[PDB]
JSON list of C-alpha atoms in Angstrom, two decimals:
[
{"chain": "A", "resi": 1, "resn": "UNK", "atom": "CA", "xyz": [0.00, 0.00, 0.00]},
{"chain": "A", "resi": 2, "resn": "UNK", "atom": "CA", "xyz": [2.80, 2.40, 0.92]},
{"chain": "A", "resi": 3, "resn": "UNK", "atom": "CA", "xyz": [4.76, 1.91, -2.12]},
{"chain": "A", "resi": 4, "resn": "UNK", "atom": "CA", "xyz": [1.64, 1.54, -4.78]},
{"chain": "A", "resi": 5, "resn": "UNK", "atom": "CA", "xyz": [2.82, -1.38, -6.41]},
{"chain": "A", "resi": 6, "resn": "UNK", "atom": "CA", "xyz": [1.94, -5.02, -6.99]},
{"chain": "A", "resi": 7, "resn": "UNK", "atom": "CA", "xyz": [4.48, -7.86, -6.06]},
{"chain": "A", "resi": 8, "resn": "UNK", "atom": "CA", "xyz": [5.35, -9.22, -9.13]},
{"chain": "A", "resi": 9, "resn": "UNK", "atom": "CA", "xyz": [7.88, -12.44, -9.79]},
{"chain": "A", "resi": 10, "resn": "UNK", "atom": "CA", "xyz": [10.02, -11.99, -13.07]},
{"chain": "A", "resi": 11, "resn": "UNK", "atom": "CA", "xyz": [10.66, -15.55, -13.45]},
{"chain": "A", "resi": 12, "resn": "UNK", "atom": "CA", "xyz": [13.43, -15.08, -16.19]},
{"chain": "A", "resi": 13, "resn": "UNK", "atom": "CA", "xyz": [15.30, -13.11, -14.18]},
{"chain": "A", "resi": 14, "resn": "UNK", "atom": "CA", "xyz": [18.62, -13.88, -11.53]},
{"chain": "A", "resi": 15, "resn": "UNK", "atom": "CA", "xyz": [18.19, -12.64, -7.86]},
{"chain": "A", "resi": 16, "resn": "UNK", "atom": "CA", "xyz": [20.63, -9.92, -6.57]},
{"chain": "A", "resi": 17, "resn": "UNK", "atom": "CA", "xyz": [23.24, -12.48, -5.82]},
{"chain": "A", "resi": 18, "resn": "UNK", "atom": "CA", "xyz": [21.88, -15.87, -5.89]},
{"chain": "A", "resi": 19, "resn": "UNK", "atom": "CA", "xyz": [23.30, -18.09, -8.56]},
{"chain": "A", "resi": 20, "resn": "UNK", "atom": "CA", "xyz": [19.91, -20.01, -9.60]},
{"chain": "A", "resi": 21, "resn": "UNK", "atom": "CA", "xyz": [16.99, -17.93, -7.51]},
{"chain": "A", "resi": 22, "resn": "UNK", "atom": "CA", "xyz": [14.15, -15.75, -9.37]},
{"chain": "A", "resi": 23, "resn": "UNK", "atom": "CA", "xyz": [13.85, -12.38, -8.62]},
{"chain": "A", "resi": 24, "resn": "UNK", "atom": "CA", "xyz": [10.81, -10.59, -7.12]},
{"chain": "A", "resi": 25, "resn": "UNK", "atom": "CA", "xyz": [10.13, -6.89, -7.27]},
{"chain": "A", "resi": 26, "resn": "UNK", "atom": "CA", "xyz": [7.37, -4.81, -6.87]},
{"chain": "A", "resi": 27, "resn": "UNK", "atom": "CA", "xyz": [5.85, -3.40, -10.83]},
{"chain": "A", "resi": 28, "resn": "UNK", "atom": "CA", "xyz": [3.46, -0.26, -10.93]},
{"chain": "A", "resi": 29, "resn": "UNK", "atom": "CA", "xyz": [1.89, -2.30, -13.59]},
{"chain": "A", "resi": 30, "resn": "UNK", "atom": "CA", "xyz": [2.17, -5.89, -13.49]},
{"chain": "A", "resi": 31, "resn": "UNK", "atom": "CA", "xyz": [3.92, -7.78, -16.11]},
{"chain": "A", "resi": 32, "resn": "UNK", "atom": "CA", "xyz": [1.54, -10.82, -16.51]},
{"chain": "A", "resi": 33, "resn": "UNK", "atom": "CA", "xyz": [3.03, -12.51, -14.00]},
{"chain": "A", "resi": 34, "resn": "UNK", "atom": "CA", "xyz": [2.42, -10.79, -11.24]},
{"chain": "A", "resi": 35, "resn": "UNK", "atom": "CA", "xyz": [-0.46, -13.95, -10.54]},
{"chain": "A", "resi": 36, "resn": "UNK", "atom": "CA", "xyz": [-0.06, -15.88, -7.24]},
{"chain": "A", "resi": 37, "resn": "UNK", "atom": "CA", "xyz": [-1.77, -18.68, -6.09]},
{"chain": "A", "resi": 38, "resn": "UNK", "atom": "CA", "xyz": [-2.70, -19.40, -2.66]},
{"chain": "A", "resi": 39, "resn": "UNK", "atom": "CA", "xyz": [-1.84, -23.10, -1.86]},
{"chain": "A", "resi": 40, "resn": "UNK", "atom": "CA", "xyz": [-2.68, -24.69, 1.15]},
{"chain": "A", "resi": 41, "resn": "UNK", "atom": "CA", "xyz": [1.12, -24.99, 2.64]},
{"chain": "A", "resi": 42, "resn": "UNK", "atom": "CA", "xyz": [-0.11, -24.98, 6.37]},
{"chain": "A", "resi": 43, "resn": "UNK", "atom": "CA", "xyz": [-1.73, -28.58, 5.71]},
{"chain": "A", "resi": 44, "resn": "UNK", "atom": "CA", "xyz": [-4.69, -27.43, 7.16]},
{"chain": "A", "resi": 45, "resn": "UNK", "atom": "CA", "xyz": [-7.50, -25.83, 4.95]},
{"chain": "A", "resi": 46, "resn": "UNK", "atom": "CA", "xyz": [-7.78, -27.74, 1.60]},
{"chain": "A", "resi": 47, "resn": "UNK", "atom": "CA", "xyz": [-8.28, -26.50, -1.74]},
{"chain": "A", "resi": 48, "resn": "UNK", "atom": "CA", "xyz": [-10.52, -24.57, -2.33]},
{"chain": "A", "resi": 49, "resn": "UNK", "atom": "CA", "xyz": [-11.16, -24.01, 1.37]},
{"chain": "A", "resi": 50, "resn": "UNK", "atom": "CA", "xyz": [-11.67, -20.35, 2.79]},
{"chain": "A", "resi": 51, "resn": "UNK", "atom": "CA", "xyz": [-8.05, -18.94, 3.31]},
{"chain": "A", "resi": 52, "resn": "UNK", "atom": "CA", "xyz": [-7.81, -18.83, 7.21]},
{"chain": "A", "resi": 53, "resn": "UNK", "atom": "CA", "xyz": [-6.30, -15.97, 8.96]},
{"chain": "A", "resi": 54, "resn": "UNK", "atom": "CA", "xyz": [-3.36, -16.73, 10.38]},
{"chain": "A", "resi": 55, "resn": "UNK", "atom": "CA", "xyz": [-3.30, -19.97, 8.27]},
{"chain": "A", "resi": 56, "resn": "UNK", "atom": "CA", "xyz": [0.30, -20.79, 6.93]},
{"chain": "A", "resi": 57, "resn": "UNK", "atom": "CA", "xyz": [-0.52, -19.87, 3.20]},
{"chain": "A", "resi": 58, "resn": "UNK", "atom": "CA", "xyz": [1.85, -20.89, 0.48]},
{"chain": "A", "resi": 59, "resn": "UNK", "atom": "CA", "xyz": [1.71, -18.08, -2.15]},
{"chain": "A", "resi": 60, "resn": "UNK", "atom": "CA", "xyz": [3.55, -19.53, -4.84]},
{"chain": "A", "resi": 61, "resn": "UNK", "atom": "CA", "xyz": [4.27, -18.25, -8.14]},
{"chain": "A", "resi": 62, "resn": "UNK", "atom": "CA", "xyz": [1.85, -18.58, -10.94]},
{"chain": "A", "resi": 63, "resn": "UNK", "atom": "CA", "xyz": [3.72, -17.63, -14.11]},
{"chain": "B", "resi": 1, "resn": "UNK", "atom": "CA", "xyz": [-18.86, -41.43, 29.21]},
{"chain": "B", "resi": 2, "resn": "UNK", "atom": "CA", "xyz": [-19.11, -44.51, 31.19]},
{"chain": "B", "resi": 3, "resn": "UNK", "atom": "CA", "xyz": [-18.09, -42.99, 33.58]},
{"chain": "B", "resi": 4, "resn": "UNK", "atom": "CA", "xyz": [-20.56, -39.73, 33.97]},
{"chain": "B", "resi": 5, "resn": "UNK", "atom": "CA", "xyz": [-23.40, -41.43, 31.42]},
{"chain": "B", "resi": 6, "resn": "UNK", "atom": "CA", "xyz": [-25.26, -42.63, 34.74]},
{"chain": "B", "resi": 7, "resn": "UNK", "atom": "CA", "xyz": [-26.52, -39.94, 37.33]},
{"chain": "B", "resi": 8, "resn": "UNK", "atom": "CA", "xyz": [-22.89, -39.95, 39.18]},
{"chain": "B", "resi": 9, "resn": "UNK", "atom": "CA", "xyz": [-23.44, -36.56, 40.46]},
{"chain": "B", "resi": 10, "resn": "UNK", "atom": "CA", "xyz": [-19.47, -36.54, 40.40]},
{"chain": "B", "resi": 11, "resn": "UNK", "atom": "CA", "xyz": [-17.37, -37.58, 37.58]},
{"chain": "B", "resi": 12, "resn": "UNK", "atom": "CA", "xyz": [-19.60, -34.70, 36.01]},
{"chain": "B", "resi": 13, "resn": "UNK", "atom": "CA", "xyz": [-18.82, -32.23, 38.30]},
{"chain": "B", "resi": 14, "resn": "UNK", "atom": "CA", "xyz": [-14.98, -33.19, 38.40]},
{"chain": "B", "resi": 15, "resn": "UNK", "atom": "CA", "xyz": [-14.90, -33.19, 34.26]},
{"chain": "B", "resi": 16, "resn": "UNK", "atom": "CA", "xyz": [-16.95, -29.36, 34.06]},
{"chain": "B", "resi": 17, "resn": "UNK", "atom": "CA", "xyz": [-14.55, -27.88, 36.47]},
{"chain": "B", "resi": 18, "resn": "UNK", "atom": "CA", "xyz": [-11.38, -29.16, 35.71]},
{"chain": "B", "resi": 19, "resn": "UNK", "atom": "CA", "xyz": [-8.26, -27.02, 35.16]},
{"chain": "B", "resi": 20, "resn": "UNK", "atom": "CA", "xyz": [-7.37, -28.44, 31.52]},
{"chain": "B", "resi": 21, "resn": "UNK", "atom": "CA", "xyz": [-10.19, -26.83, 28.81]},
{"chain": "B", "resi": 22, "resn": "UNK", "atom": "CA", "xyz": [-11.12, -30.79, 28.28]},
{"chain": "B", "resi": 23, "resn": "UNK", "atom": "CA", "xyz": [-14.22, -29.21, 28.18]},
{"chain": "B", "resi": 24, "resn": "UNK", "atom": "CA", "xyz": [-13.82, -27.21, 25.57]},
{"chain": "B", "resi": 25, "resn": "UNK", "atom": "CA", "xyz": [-12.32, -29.80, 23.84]},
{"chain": "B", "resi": 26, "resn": "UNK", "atom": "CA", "xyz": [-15.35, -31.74, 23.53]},
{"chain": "B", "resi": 27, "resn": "UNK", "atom": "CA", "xyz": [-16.87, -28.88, 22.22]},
{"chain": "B", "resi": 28, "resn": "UNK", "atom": "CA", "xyz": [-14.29, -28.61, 19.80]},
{"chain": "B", "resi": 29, "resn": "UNK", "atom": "CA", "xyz": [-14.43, -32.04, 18.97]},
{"chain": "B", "resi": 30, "resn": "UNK", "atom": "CA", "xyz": [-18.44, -31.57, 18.23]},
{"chain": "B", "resi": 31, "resn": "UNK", "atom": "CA", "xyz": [-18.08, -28.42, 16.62]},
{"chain": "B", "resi": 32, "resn": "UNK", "atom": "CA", "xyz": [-14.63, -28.19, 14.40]},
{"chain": "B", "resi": 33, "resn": "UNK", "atom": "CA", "xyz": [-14.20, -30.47, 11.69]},
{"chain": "B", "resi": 34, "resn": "UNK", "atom": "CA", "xyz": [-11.02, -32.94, 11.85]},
{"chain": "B", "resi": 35, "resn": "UNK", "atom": "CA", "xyz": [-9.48, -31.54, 8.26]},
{"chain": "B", "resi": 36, "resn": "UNK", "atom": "CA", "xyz": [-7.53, -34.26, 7.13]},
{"chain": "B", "resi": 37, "resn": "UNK", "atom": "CA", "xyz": [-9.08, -37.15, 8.41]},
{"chain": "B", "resi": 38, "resn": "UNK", "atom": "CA", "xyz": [-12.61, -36.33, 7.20]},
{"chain": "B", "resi": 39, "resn": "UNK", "atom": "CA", "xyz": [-11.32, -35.22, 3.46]},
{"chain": "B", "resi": 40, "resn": "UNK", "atom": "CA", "xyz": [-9.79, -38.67, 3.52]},
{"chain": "B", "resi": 41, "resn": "UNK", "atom": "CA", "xyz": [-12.21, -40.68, 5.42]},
{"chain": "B", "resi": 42, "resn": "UNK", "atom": "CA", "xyz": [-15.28, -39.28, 6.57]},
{"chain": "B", "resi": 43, "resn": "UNK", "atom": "CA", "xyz": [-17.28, -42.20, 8.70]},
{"chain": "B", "resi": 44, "resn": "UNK", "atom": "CA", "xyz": [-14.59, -41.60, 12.33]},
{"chain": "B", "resi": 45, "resn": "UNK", "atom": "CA", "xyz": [-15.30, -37.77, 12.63]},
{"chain": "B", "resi": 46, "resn": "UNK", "atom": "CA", "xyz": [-19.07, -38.53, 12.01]},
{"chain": "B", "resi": 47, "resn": "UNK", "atom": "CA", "xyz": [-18.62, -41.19, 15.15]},
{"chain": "B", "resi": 48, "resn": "UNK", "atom": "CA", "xyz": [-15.81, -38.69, 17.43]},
{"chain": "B", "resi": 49, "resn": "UNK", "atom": "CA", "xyz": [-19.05, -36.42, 16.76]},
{"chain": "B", "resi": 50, "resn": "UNK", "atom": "CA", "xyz": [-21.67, -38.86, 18.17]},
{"chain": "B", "resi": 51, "resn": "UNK", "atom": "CA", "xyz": [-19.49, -39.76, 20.69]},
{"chain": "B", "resi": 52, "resn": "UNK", "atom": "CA", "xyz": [-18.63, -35.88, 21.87]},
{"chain": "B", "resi": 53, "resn": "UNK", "atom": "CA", "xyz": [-22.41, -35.18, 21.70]},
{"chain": "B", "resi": 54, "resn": "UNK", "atom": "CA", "xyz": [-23.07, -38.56, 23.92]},
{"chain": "B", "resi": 55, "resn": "UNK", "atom": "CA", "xyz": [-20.73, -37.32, 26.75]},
{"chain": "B", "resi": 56, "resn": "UNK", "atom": "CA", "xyz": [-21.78, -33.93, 26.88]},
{"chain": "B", "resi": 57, "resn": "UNK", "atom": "CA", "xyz": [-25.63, -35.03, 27.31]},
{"chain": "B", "resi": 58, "resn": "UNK", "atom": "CA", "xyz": [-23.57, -37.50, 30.27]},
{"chain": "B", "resi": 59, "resn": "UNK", "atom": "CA", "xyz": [-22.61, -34.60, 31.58]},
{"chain": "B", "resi": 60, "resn": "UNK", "atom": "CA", "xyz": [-25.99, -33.10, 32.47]},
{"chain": "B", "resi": 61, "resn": "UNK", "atom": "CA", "xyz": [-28.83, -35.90, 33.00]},
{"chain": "B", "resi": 62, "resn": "UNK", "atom": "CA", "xyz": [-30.41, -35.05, 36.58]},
{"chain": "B", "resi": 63, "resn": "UNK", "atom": "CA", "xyz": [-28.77, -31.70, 36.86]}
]
């Protein structure tokens, strides 16, 4: 909210020093990618299941 | 169960005010739903159900 941007993934893309990481940034725009889906990493909703506050989400990259 | 399901007059009072939120665990127990084990098999948290809501009448009979 402060900065006005979305948190998008540019998958073909090196981190800042990482030899074989993606990088993530934040786009005023959004580059297509900038899609993330909510898995259930907490093992405790399922999918499709309301996302539970608090629940260990797993947002994981969509492009 | 056995042990409050007659009129004891005891076990129920012992089990009500006890020191460990057992009680609210039975209420859990009726209420939430177990979420793995009923995705995967449905029939034992229909029967920890019956068996939660079987205690808890126990634990009022001629009160």
């Amino acid at each position: 909210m402060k900065s006005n941007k979305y948190l998008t993934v540019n998958k073909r893309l090196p981190a800042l020093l990482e030899k074989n990481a993606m990088r993530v940034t934040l786009d005023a725009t959004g580059n297509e990618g900038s899609w993330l889906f909510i898995q259930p990493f907490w093992k405790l909703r399922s999918n499709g299941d309301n996302v539970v506050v608090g629940d260990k989400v797993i947002l994981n990259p969509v492009n | 169960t056995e042990y409050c399901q007659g009129p004891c007059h005891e076990n129920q009072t012992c089990i009500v005010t006890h020191e460990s939120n057992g009680i609210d665990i039975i209420t859990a127990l009726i209420l939430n739903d177990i979420s793995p084990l009923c995705k995967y098999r449905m029939d034992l948290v229909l029967q920890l159900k019956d068996n939660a809501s079987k205690l808890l009448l126990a634990l009022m009979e001629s009160r």
